[PDB]
Write an enzyme that holds these catalytic residues in place. Sequence first.
Site, mmCIF file in Angstrom:
data_model
loop_
_atom_site.group_PDB
_atom_site.id
_atom_site.type_symbol
_atom_site.label_atom_id
_atom_site.label_comp_id
_atom_site.label_asym_id
_atom_site.label_seq_id
_atom_site.Cartn_x
_atom_site.Cartn_y
_atom_site.Cartn_z
ATOM 1 C CG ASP A 1 -5.250 -92.824 122.079
ATOM 2 O OD1 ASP A 1 -6.199 -93.079 122.775
ATOM 3 O OD2 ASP A 1 -4.393 -91.986 121.987
ATOM 4 C CD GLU B 1 -2.247 -86.644 121.958
ATOM 5 O OE1 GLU B 1 -2.924 -87.458 122.292
ATOM 6 O OE2 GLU B 1 -1.864 -85.695 123.139
ATOM 7 C CD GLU C 1 -4.593 -84.680 129.667
ATOM 8 O OE1 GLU C 1 -4.862 -85.676 128.990
ATOM 9 O OE2 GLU C 1 -4.061 -83.811 129.141
ATOM 10 C CD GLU D 1 -9.107 -93.612 129.605
ATOM 11 O OE1 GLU D 1 -8.392 -94.267 128.836
ATOM 12 O OE2 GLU D 1 -9.717 -92.517 129.315
HETATM 13 C C1 LIG Z 1 -8.732 -93.421 126.028
HETATM 14 C C2 LIG Z 1 -7.788 -92.374 126.233
HETATM 15 N N1 LIG Z 1 -7.326 -91.442 127.186
HETATM 16 C C3 LIG Z 1 -6.534 -90.721 127.380
HETATM 17 C C4 LIG Z 1 -5.568 -90.301 126.330
HETATM 18 C C5 LIG Z 1 -4.645 -89.452 126.093
HETATM 19 O O1 LIG Z 1 -4.457 -88.655 127.217
HETATM 20 C C6 LIG Z 1 -5.878 -91.082 125.254
HETATM 21 N N2 LIG Z 1 -5.133 -90.782 123.903
HETATM 22 N N3 LIG Z 1 -6.822 -92.124 125.187
#
Ligand SMILES: Cc1ncc(CO)c(N)n1
EC number: 3.5.1.-
Length: 215
Positions: free
Chosen positions: A43, A84, A136, A206
Amino acid sequence: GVIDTWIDKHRSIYTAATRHAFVVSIRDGSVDLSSFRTWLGQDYLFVRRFVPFVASVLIRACKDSGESSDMEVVLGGIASLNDEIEWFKREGSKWDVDFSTVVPQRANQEYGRFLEDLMSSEVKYPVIMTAFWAIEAVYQESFAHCLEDGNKTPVELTGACHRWGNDGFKQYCSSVKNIAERCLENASGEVLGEAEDVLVRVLELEVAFWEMSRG
Ligand SMILES: Cc1ncc(CO)c(N)n1
């Protein structure tokens, strides 16, 4: 609305794409940070790719005007990314995760390329906003209730759940949703079609991202 119709029409990969980002477990009587550390690493490299992406959406809202406040809806999103991104560096250090030594995996290198296919001026603003929104919303959905279901597990790891589970991010993702919804509400057969393929398409990535760290 146009979006709920689509999510509820596609609750499917949406649910798949919206399951906890990293789990936590117990082995040989030691808290096991296997997924968590896998997720943190992957991430962080994406977030680094997500940053310039959004940059390109900010530049678009300023020239594909509908409302004056759109840029500020987006400008804030990108804004938290500074903190972040700063938060990821603190975690890397307290969890002994070396970002310079993380290997970006297939479902991640790929997302690097897709976000790129959104940075081009050739893509329509409504499509771009839809992606920026969906991205988001999924992390918001992936992180909701977490705090509460956090006291129903042996050892909870709470540092992330606070970053994507607070009430400020819920309404931020919301100011972003308010825009998306207003744009899709004008898109002609060509562009709308282009958008839904994208909502359902953010969910696909995702899901295949979420699998890297599964537990
Ligand atoms: C895969 C993915 N989708 C969304 C976010 C953050 O919104 C993230 N950090 N990673």
